[PDB]
Design an enzyme around this catalytic site. Structure first.
Site, short mmCIF file in Angstrom:
data_model
loop_
_atom_site.label_atom_id
_atom_site.label_comp_id
_atom_site.label_asym_id
_atom_site.label_seq_id
_atom_site.Cartn_x
_atom_site.Cartn_y
_atom_site.Cartn_z
CG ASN A 11 -0.49 0.38 2.54
OD1 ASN A 11 -0.07 1.83 2.74
ND2 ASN A 11 -0.15 -0.20 3.58
CB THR A 39 -13.88 4.69 10.56
OG1 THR A 39 -12.93 3.91 10.49
CG2 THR A 39 -15.33 4.55 9.88
CG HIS A 56 -0.37 -9.48 9.21
ND1 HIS A 56 -0.27 -9.63 7.94
CD2 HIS A 56 1.33 -8.84 9.27
CE1 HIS A 56 0.84 -9.48 7.33
NE2 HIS A 56 1.93 -8.86 8.01
CD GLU A 111 0.99 -5.25 8.43
OE1 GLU A 111 1.04 -5.86 7.02
OE2 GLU A 111 2.20 -4.55 8.75
CD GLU A 112 1.31 -7.19 4.13
OE1 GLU A 112 1.88 -5.98 4.02
OE2 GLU A 112 2.18 -8.19 4.26
CG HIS A 150 5.04 -6.89 0.46
ND1 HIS A 150 4.55 -5.46 0.76
CD2 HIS A 150 5.07 -7.59 1.69
CE1 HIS A 150 4.37 -5.73 2.13
NE2 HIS A 150 4.34 -6.79 2.64
CB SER A 175 17.40 27.79 26.32
OG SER A 175 18.28 27.05 27.36
CG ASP A 182 -1.98 0.17 38.91
OD1 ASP A 182 -1.75 -0.89 38.24
OD2 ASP A 182 -2.73 0.58 39.67
CG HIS A 191 5.32 7.67 22.76
ND1 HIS A 191 6.68 8.18 23.24
CD2 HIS A 191 5.22 6.64 23.29
CE1 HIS A 191 7.12 7.32 24.23
NE2 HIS A 191 6.26 6.38 24.21
O1 LIG Z 1 0.89 0.57 6.20
C1 LIG Z 1 1.67 0.24 6.87
O2 LIG Z 1 2.12 0.94 7.53
C2 LIG Z 1 2.71 -1.17 6.61
C3 LIG Z 1 2.02 -2.18 5.97
C4 LIG Z 1 2.97 -3.15 5.45
N1 LIG Z 1 3.96 -3.64 6.52
C5 LIG Z 1 5.09 -4.26 6.39
O3 LIG Z 1 5.21 -4.85 5.35
N2 LIG Z 1 5.97 -4.08 7.49
C6 LIG Z 1 7.34 -5.09 7.13
C7 LIG Z 1 8.14 -3.88 6.58
C8 LIG Z 1 9.58 -4.47 6.25
C9 LIG Z 1 10.10 -3.21 5.64
C10 LIG Z 1 11.40 -3.52 4.73
N3 LIG Z 1 12.17 -2.03 4.48
C11 LIG Z 1 12.74 -1.43 5.47
C12 LIG Z 1 13.01 -0.55 4.43
C13 LIG Z 1 13.87 0.74 4.89
O4 LIG Z 1 13.43 1.65 6.12
C14 LIG Z 1 14.39 1.82 6.86
C15 LIG Z 1 14.26 1.00 8.54
O5 LIG Z 1 14.73 2.01 9.69
C16 LIG Z 1 15.91 1.59 9.95
C17 LIG Z 1 16.81 3.13 9.91
O6 LIG Z 1 17.72 2.98 10.78
C18 LIG Z 1 19.08 3.46 9.85
C19 LIG Z 1 19.64 4.55 10.89
O7 LIG Z 1 20.28 3.69 11.97
C20 LIG Z 1 19.98 4.51 13.39
C21 LIG Z 1 19.15 3.80 14.33
O8 LIG Z 1 17.95 3.44 13.90
C22 LIG Z 1 16.97 4.74 14.17
C23 LIG Z 1 15.74 4.45 13.06
O9 LIG Z 1 14.56 3.98 13.66
C24 LIG Z 1 14.63 2.70 14.25
C25 LIG Z 1 13.34 1.97 14.17
O10 LIG Z 1 13.34 0.71 13.01
C26 LIG Z 1 14.43 0.32 12.48
C27 LIG Z 1 14.89 -1.37 12.73
O11 LIG Z 1 16.11 -1.47 12.19
C28 LIG Z 1 16.77 -1.99 13.07
C29 LIG Z 1 18.36 -1.39 13.04
N4 LIG Z 1 19.23 -2.49 13.11
C30 LIG Z 1 20.52 -2.70 12.75
C31 LIG Z 1 21.27 -1.37 12.35
C32 LIG Z 1 22.42 -1.47 12.20
C33 LIG Z 1 23.18 -2.71 12.12
N5 LIG Z 1 24.66 -2.73 11.81
O12 LIG Z 1 25.26 -3.85 11.74
O13 LIG Z 1 25.23 -1.67 11.07
C34 LIG Z 1 22.60 -3.83 12.38
C35 LIG Z 1 21.29 -3.82 12.81
N6 LIG Z 1 20.43 -5.13 13.05
O14 LIG Z 1 19.42 -4.98 13.37
O15 LIG Z 1 21.26 -6.08 13.24
N7 LIG Z 1 12.75 -0.66 3.42
N8 LIG Z 1 12.02 -1.62 3.20
C36 LIG Z 1 7.56 -5.55 8.55
O16 LIG Z 1 7.64 -4.69 9.57
O17 LIG Z 1 8.05 -6.70 8.50
C37 LIG Z 1 3.91 -2.37 4.53
O18 LIG Z 1 5.16 -1.86 4.77
O19 LIG Z 1 3.73 -2.45 3.30
CA LIG Z 2 -11.62 3.78 12.66
ZN LIG Z 3 3.76 -8.33 7.64
ZN LIG Z 4 3.96 -7.02 4.60
#
Ligand SMILES: O=C(O)CC[C@H](NC(=O)N[C@@H](CCCCn1cc(COCCOCCOCCOCCOCCOCCOCCOCCNc2ccc([N+](=O)O)cc2[N+](=O)O)nn1)C(=O)O)C(=O)O
Ligand SMILES: [Ca+2]
Ligand SMILES: [Zn+2]
Ligand SMILES: [Zn+2]
Ligand SMILES: O=C(O)CC[C@H](NC(=O)N[C@@H](CCCCn1cc(COCCOCCOCCOCCOCCOCCOCCOCCNc2ccc([N+](=O)O)cc2[N+](=O)O)nn1)C(=O)O)C(=O)O
Ligand SMILES: *[C@@H]1O[C@H](CO)[C@@H](O[C@@H]2O[C@H](CO)[C@@H](O[C@@H]3O[C@H](CO)[C@@H](O)[C@H](O[C@H]4O[C@H](CO)[C@@H](O)[C@H](O)[C@@H]4O)[C@@H]3O)[C@H](O)[C@H]2NC(C)=O)[C@H](O)[C@H]1NC(C)=O
Ligand SMILES: *[C@@H]1O[C@H](CO)[C@@H](O[C@@H]2O[C@H](CO)[C@@H](O[C@@H]3O[C@H](CO)[C@@H](O)[C@H](O[C@H]4O[C@H](CO)[C@@H](O)[C@H](O)[C@@H]4O)[C@@H]3O)[C@H](O)[C@H]2NC(C)=O)[C@H](O)[C@H]1NC(C)=O
Ligand SMILES: *[C@@H]1O[C@H](CO)[C@@H](O[C@@H]2O[C@H](CO)[C@@H](O)[C@H](O)[C@H]2NC(C)=O)[C@H](O)[C@H]1NC(C)=O
Ligand SMILES: *[C@@H]1O[C@H](CO)[C@@H](O[C@@H]2O[C@H](CO)[C@@H](O)[C@H](O)[C@H]2NC(C)=O)[C@H](O)[C@H]1NC(C)=O
Ligand SMILES: *[C@@H]1O[C@H](CO)[C@@H](O[C@@H]2O[C@H](CO)[C@@H](O)[C@H](O)[C@H]2NC(C)=O)[C@H](O)[C@H]1NC(C)=O
Ligand SMILES: *[C@@H]1O[C@H](CO)[C@@H](O[C@@H]2O[C@H](CO)[C@@H](O)[C@H](O)[C@H]2NC(C)=O)[C@H](O)[C@H]1NC(C)=O
Ligand SMILES: *[C@@H]1O[C@H](CO)[C@@H](O[C@@H]2O[C@H](CO)[C@@H](O)[C@H](O)[C@H]2NC(C)=O)[C@H](O)[C@H]1NC(C)=O
Ligand SMILES: *[C@@H]1O[C@H](CO)[C@@H](O[C@@H]2O[C@H](CO)[C@@H](O)[C@H](O)[C@H]2NC(C)=O)[C@H](O)[C@H]1NC(C)=O
Ligand SMILES: *[C@@H]1O[C@H](CO)[C@@H](O)[C@H](O)[C@H]1NC(C)=O
Ligand SMILES: *[C@@H]1O[C@H](CO)[C@@H](O)[C@H](O)[C@H]1NC(C)=O
Ligand SMILES: *[C@@H]1O[C@H](CO)[C@@H](O)[C@H](O)[C@H]1NC(C)=O
Ligand SMILES: *[C@@H]1O[C@H](CO)[C@@H](O)[C@H](O)[C@H]1NC(C)=O
Ligand SMILES: *[C@@H]1O[C@H](CO)[C@@H](O)[C@H](O)[C@H]1NC(C)=O
Ligand SMILES: *[C@@H]1O[C@H](CO)[C@@H](O)[C@H](O)[C@H]1NC(C)=O
Ligand SMILES: [Ca+2]
Ligand SMILES: [Cl-]
Ligand SMILES: [Cl-]
Ligand SMILES: [Zn+2]
Ligand SMILES: [Zn+2]
EC number: 3.4.17.21
Lengths: 694, 694
Positions: free
Chosen positions: A203, A215, A323, A370-371, A499, A574, A610, A633
């Site tokens: 999406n 809604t 989901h 969810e999708e 996907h 500040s 709590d 939040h």
């Molecule tokens: O309608 C909807 O809302 C969604 C419906 C659907 N939902 C969905 O399919 N969800 C899938 C989504 C899969 C998405 C794939 N994807 C991701 C992306 C890119 O988006 C970026 C993800 O955020 C990461 C940004 O971080 C980079 C900067 O690093 C600084 C710290 O991060 C802060 C940013 O916010 C963090 C919150 O989520 C990020 C989780 O990622 C974990 C990072 N982990 C690692 C990082 C570094 C690393 N390393 O070795 O250097 C290792 C890491 N690690 O996890 O091992 N493109 N495609 C799911 O949740 O499984 C859809 O998306 O169509």
């Molecule tokens: Ca609603």
């Molecule tokens: Zn999913």
């Molecule tokens: Zn998905």
């Protein structure tokens, strides 16, 4: 004895394998009969497994589907209006599935209808900074152009929002092998890479937490009043469609105009990656034409909600939710997660049949739609918001259990960091080379914390999954965990077959987790977290860990502001109040922790439980963030530039973003100061909830 | 024994008399040094009385004061610009007070500055229906005119809003003897009537619950970011000033133009009550000129907050609050209430010194700046909102204890009806002729319920006092009680000397309550309610009483809609969902009551006490009512036409109001249907909080 070890030992890799196979033989697209039958199956099975009640909760929400007799496609057309090239009408189905019906062809859910014709502009990943580069540095105007953007880096809905704001009349999304084809691995079915005919569905809404577009704020029940389409939340205004890289190469190869500004704009195809607009001279009179005929339709969706009543605190809820709807077979997304939930329910139910109950109530959810924008979870949480905000302990998500086979990935509230460290020290690592060692040891070795030696990385929650309503709207402590790839050696985004029709049971069994050992490990982490949250006498939240991260985030946002020292002088900007609040929170949390460790009195305990439960709640501002009323939040929101990423102190961050480009600096810096005041107030108010109560 | 009877017996009429005398010798205007000294005195005394902690909570809020060296007044001016008549610069002070300094002259708080000159239009009480009559029936245009309106019937801020929307360039408010002079009673000092030189002070804001105009949503603390004046909430756009009836008669006597439309437009002065515009022929070239020079100024205010920690549930708060600031001496408003609070604190503290503590925490508050828009209570509740919404049991207001000497008046949430009936059956009536009988018996005889034989009238809460933030914003069960006049035989509004310099200790001691027996009775009611709420094992709320009133309010709003049967047919406007929800609430509440009566288990108890506490909370909609985000209770809001009056199902009521005049009926009836959906959803969601929790 019924303790965590008993629960964990009952979990079986072979059961998760059996369930995954069972859930992925046919498509389960939201709103279709197949996904209602699977809902009924899960409801029956959870009852069999021993849950106290298992109900379906249904809603009628806006969904979007292609027109089966008027297919979507893109053409290159000549001067005569002859369509000389057409993109594919479907992905070649994988072996043995070439006769499966009801595979939805690739499309962008919620695209409007249209047949725009025009010149292409290539916009890289269509990020905010890509459009800045085009407009500000290259002086390329996207107004009235069709833009083509590669998938990756940010959520696709932000790409489409960015393109609309640039004046595009349509958007073409494609998967570049740079981002979806790992070097040295074969395409599906012979490996886990995306073939040139593969296409990523998804999406393209910009809901900002609203749930069903028609809604916002209220559940889409039987008597709901619905907005008209023109007033719906989050719908795109221009047509959008996704394609694979064989088709993209045909669209990009003829591109003319400006060269790419640098190598970060070049993917891996054998094309120049010219920005345009339009094609090179010989083809300058050719144009690109989209044909989009999808329709949005109110459609019934079904959540399965199972209850395991608590023995001591039945009015405290620990929720494990993931989901069930999929784009096609959902081999990884979501069924690798749903099979793990199913086995967790089975294991809890085994203890229940032997006479055990958890201290607190556990709710298990199989969300629908969810999708299509987190619709099933959000509508249910809208319906039950009063119950959740006064009784909700924690929400543990359970989408895809694997996106690689390298190490653990955890994203969660700081309140869960200590619980996760402790639990993973008690679990066995499934990794080769780590036989006999803890999961904590392997995880910490492979994914070290950037801030601390001897500790593993745990990330902030972003969005793009079903915890969004519980965490960023309602303020309920939330977390998620899965197995992931090596982020160092892997430049691709997510997993390559995300996907696509190629996300099958065989992909998982052959290439990701043949023994189901990583699924089992993820089941132990998710299930163990639920177990502790639901059974621990004192809730397993450490407020001191929130204090540590709040100081980190304050330092970060101060550092962004301090790129503008002249303006901070002029407008007396500040951060002293925010640092003061964070210092106070640190002091108060330390004192609360002393009382908690050092307090037989079930009232002092529950009073203290709590205070722990309502601490995430205290970061909610009932007025929401600017123009995003469902992101409430104050510490965490999804990035305004990329829904998948979390941003800290989002209200101050967005007030500072690109501030040097604002036309009225006094007004802009005034709003920075307002957001500093809101954040400092909210951190102090959350701290005060941990003070002695009287 | 320490029980309610011990608490009640300790209360003394003579102490209330002594405290009232002490609190009314000098003015205590908000923001002045005198009112800070009184805050410090109360803080010291509450500590002496035995409270565990007593603190001042201060805020810096927008207040408004006349300019001491540039006085406000109104003139009639001739063609030459000679001011041939001027209104008074002050009220003649009462006997023995002619040398008291710092009496603020009459003014309308928050009026802007200006010297508008023009022709008068008389607008009766300046109600919505008075302006409808002028514009729609009489075809009189107020645009660019100064309007003169009599006080009474509705809050003065609604008058000024109504006049601004009619295009007035200024407003003159006056007290007509019809509304402020009871036949057969003498003017002060010889009786309790308003003299012709008396004038009613009061603010003219339209805050809709916001609190300080400059900081809506957040406390006005040391680092608060403040809106600029142009963006402030609720300020009037035209100058306004109040006068007495001697001066009004000089302004009205020359009025020409149209005759009054009927007798309901005629007051008691010897003038024709012509509507205008302007004066009769001979004086047609004369005009009225206002001179307003008041200034708005950010000023520090101080709440006193006393805590009596609970023995068993210290994290549950029962709050007894009333204001301390007054316009002048505050003989009735507020000090008749503050003296009762003071004696209640003294009595609780006496028990405390003997070793007793209440089960729950009691908080006692002396609010500041109530007169300037409920500022002190609202800013404190903004600061402490997270604590209040998770821990707040009930709020009992304590402004004026008397406005007459005839019978009791109670306004409160339905959840308190049973507590009030039960308590008043245990209290002695202070009324002549009811010696030896209960207060319930005298009250029921004098003020019978319109709906039920053998029961007394209890009204909905309106607004215009310090419970507004706790009830309509935060959803905490609230109530108030005082002694009142006979509404049958008395046509005047409130009490005649309201907000005048003549509201003194002598007014109360000589004319209202010489023995202080009615004050003592009100102390027993307020104090008894606090006692029960804070000490009862099961909270003393009956959810079944909410069910009864919800059906009454549903019947009422359905009846309004059914004045438009054609439109309900055309637009398919059904109340079926709302009646369904109310039926469900009735059923669920009955079952909950059975469990409550029929459930040793302190968890089931507190679980049940939380269901009782959070039931008022469940009527809150976090999105607020349309354009009034701080009025969030779906069942009750202050009337959009009169802040003092409560309205039931306000969102549906305002959607239906004057709907036959809307230009797009489809849109208007669509919004009625949306509000029916919101109300039906909210009643069902509140019902579900009383269901078994798992
Ligand atoms: O309608 C909807 O809302 C969604 C419906 C659907 N939902 C969905 O399919 N969800 C899938 C989504 C899969 C998405 C794939 N994807 C991701 C992306 C890119 O988006 C970026 C993800 O955020 C990461 C940004 O971080 C980079 C900067 O690093 C600084 C710290 O991060 C802060 C940013 O916010 C963090 C919150 O989520 C990020 C989780 O990622 C974990 C990072 N982990 C690692 C990082 C570094 C690393 N390393 O070795 O250097 C290792 C890491 N690690 O996890 O091992 N493109 N495609 C799911 O949740 O499984 C859809 O998306 O169509
Ligand atoms: Ca609603
Ligand atoms: Zn999913
Ligand atoms: Zn998905
Ligand atoms: O900034 C601010 O917000 C306020 C600051 C300050 N605050 C303040 O001064 N507060 C004072 C205000 C004193 C106001 C005096 N006043 C009142 C008025 C008129 O406003 C109308 C009051 O609402 C009553 C409408 O009811 C008439 C329709 O009856 C149907 C049922 O009532 C539903 C309307 O909402 C009810 C909520 O409040 C009404 C409480 O009145 C109780 C009615 N009781 C009786 C009714 C009938 C009766 N009877 O014998 O027929 C007897 C009654 N009784 O109580 O014995 N004008 N002046 C105080 O709270 O003590 C200020 O106002 O400047
Ligand atoms: C972190 O916690 C600390 C408590 O440990 C808390 O400290 C409070 O700070 C405020 C300032 O924001 C103090 O407010 C002062 O209160 C005194 C009366 O107690 C006033 O007289 C002061 O006002 C004067 O000085 C101001 C500054 O120059 C002037 O602007 C003003 O005009 C007055 O002249 C001032 O209001 C407060 O006393 C302490 N409370 C304590 C120490 O208990 C701090 O605010 C917390 N941080 C956050 C972000 O909440
Ligand atoms: C008051 O409480 C009652 C419960 O005692 C609660 O009743 C619920 O009413 C809804 C209607 O709002 C029922 O919803 C139905 O659910 C069934 C499946 O269980 C559906 O098949 C129904 O949909 C069909 O019929 C509709 C109406 O003709 C069509 O519009 C639709 O297209 C379908 O054909 C329908 O959704 C629900 O089953 C009951 N729940 C019970 C009985 O437990 C009622 O809603 C409460 N009132 C309020 C205001 O909440
Ligand atoms: C997935 O597993 C379920 C549960 O075993 C299967 O559903 C059962 O199918 C049998 C044979 O048709 C029925 O007799 C049962 O009533 C079903 N149980 C249910 C629905 O709870 C289902 O066939 C499996 N699906 C696949 C694709 O293997
Ligand atoms: C791309 O598809 C279009 C649409 O089906 C093809 O154009 C059609 O061709 C048929 C048969 O020649 C005509 O009768 C239709 O009128 C055409 N429709 C349109 C919209 O042009 C086109 O031939 C295809 N191009 C390629 C290269 O396959
Ligand atoms: C994680 O485990 C640590 C180590 O066991 C726990 O910290 C201990 O908690 C006990 C019980 O309160 C204290 O007596 C010890 O002093 C703590 N040791 C420390 C802090 O090093 C910790 O509580 C667990 N975290 C959870 C359960 O969330
Ligand atoms: C109101 O009562 C208070 C309390 O008795 C009086 O304040 C006391 O005054 C005496 C004599 O000046 C002082 O020694 C005490 O320190 C005061 N106590 C306080 C402030 O707590 C006050 O004088 C009385 N006011 C009036 C007008 O009678
Ligand atoms: C009403 O008050 C005004 C203002 O004080 C009076 O007009 C002033 O009169 C003095 C002395 O005659 C002049 O010097 C000022 O210039 C006048 N000011 C204005 C604004 O007119 C007026 O005399 C008073 N009218 C009555 C009847 O007392
Ligand atoms: C008001 O008093 C009545 C009469 O005492 C209370 O109602 C009784 O409550 C007891 C204890 O639960 C029941 O056993 C009786 O059957 C009730 N009698 C009735 C309803 O007629 C009532 O609870 C009190 N209301 C309060 C305290 O809010
Ligand atoms: C789908 O396309 C067909 C064939 O052209 C058309 O008849 C029908 O209206 C369309 N369906 C929808 C749901 O718009
Ligand atoms: C981009 O193109 C359109 C003209 O078709 C124009 O309206 C818009 O303002 C242009 N913007 C520029 C040149 O920045
Ligand atoms: C599984 O792990 C092996 C060993 O590192 C690796 O070569 C392979 O790429 C992994 N499979 C997937 C899907 O990541
Ligand atoms: C009040 O009026 C005086 C005298 O004309 C003037 O000097 C002063 O500016 C005014 N004060 C305020 C606070 O506006
Ligand atoms: C009232 O008077 C003014 C003219 O001064 C005008 O602008 C306004 O529209 C008039 N309204 C009427 C006659 O309804
Ligand atoms: C007190 O009560 C008497 C007896 O009814 C009455 O005449 C008098 O008006 C009352 N005083 C006030 C202020 O209402
Ligand atoms: Ca405020
Ligand atoms: Cl997940
Ligand atoms: Cl009151
Ligand atoms: Zn008052
Ligand atoms: Zn008042």
């Amino acid at each position: 004895k019924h303790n965590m070890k008993a629960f964990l030992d009952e979990l079986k890799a072979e059961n998760i394998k059996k369930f995954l196979y069972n859930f992925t033989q046919i498509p389960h697209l939201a709103g279709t009969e197949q996904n209602f039958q699977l809902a009924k199956q899960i409801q029956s099975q959870w009852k069999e497994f021993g849950l106290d009640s298992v109900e379906l909760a249904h809603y009628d929400v806006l969904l979007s589907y292609p027109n089966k007799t008027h297919p979507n496609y893109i053409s290159i057309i000549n001067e005569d209006g002859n369509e000389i090239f057409n993109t594919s009408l479907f992905e070649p189905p994988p072996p043995g599935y070439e006769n499966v019906s009801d595979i939805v062809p690739p499309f962008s859910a919620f695209s409007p209808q249209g047949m725009p014709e025009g010149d292409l502009v290539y916009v890289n990943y269509a990020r905010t900074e890509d459009f800045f580069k085009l407009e500000r540095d290259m002086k390329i105007n996207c107004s009235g152009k069709i833009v083509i953007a590669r998938y990756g880096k940010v959520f696709r809905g932000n790409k489409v929002k960015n393109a609309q704001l640039a004046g595009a009349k349509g958007v073409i999304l494609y998967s570049d092998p740079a981002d979806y084809f790992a070097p040295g691995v074969k395409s599906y079915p012979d490996g886990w890479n995306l073939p040139g005919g593969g296409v990523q569905r998804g999406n393209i809404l910009n809901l900002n937490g609203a749930g069903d577009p028609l809604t916002p704020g209220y559940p889409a029940n039987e008597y709901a009043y619905r907005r008209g389409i023109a007033e719906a939340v989050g719908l795109p205004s221009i047509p959008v469609h996704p394609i694979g890289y064989y088709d993209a190469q045909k669209l990009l190869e003829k591109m003319g105009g400006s060269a790419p500004p640098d190598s970060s704009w070049r993917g891996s195809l054998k094309v120049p990656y010219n920005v345009g607009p339009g094609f090179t001279g010989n083809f300058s009179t050719q144009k690109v034409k989209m044909h989009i005929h999808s329709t949005n339709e109110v459609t019934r969706i079904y959540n399965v909600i199972g209850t395991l009543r608590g023995a001591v605190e039945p009015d405290r809820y620990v929720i494990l939710g993931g989901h069930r709807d999929s784009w096609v077979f959902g081999g990884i997304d979501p069924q690798s997660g749903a099979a793990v939930v199913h086995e967790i329910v089975r294991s809890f139910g085994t203890l229940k049949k032997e006479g055990w109950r958890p201290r607190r109530t556990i709710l298990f959810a199989s969300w629908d739609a969810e999708e299509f924008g987190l619709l099933g979870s959000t509508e249910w949480a809208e319906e039950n918001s009063r119950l959740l905000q006064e009784r909700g302990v924690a929400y543990i998500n359970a989408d895809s259990s694997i996106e690689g086979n390298y190490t653990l990935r955890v994203d969660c509230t700081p309140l869960m960091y200590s619980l996760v460290h402790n639990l993973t020290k008690e679990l066995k690592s499934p990794d080769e080379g780590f036989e006999g060692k803890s999961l904590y040891e392997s995880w910490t070795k492979k994914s070290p914390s950037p801030e601390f030696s001897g500790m593993p990385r745990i990330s902030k929650l972003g969005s793009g999954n079903d915890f969004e309503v519980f965490f960023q709207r309602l303020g309920i402590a939330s977390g998620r965990a899965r197995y992931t790839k090596n982020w160092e050696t892997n430049k691709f985004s997510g997993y390559p077959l995300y996907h696509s029709v190629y996300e099958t049971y065989e992909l998982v069994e052959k290439f990701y987790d043949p023994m189901f050992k990583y699924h089992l490990t993820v089941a132990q982490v998710r299930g163990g977290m639920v177990f502790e949250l639901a059974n621990s006498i004192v809730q397993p939240f450490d407020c001191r860990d929130y204090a540590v991260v709040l100081r980190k985030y304050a330092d970060k946002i101060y550092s962004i502001s301090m790129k503008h020292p002249q303006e901070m002088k002029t407008y007396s900007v500040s951060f002293d109040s925010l640092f003061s609040a964070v210092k106070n929170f640190t002091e108060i949390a330390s004192k609360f922790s002393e009382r908690l460790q050092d307090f037989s009195n079930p009232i002092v305990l529950r009073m203290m439980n709590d205070q722990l439960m309502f601490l995430e709640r205290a970061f909610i501002d009932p007025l929401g963030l600017p123009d995003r009323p469902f992101y409430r939040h104050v510490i965490y929101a999804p990035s305004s530039h990329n829904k998948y990423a979390g941003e800290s102190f989002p209200g101050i961050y967005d007030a500072l973003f690109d501030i040097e480009s604002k036309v009225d600096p006094s007004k802009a810096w005034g709003e920075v100061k307002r957001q500093i005041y809101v954040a400092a107030f909210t951190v102090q108010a959350a701290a005060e909830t941990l003070s002695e109560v009287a």
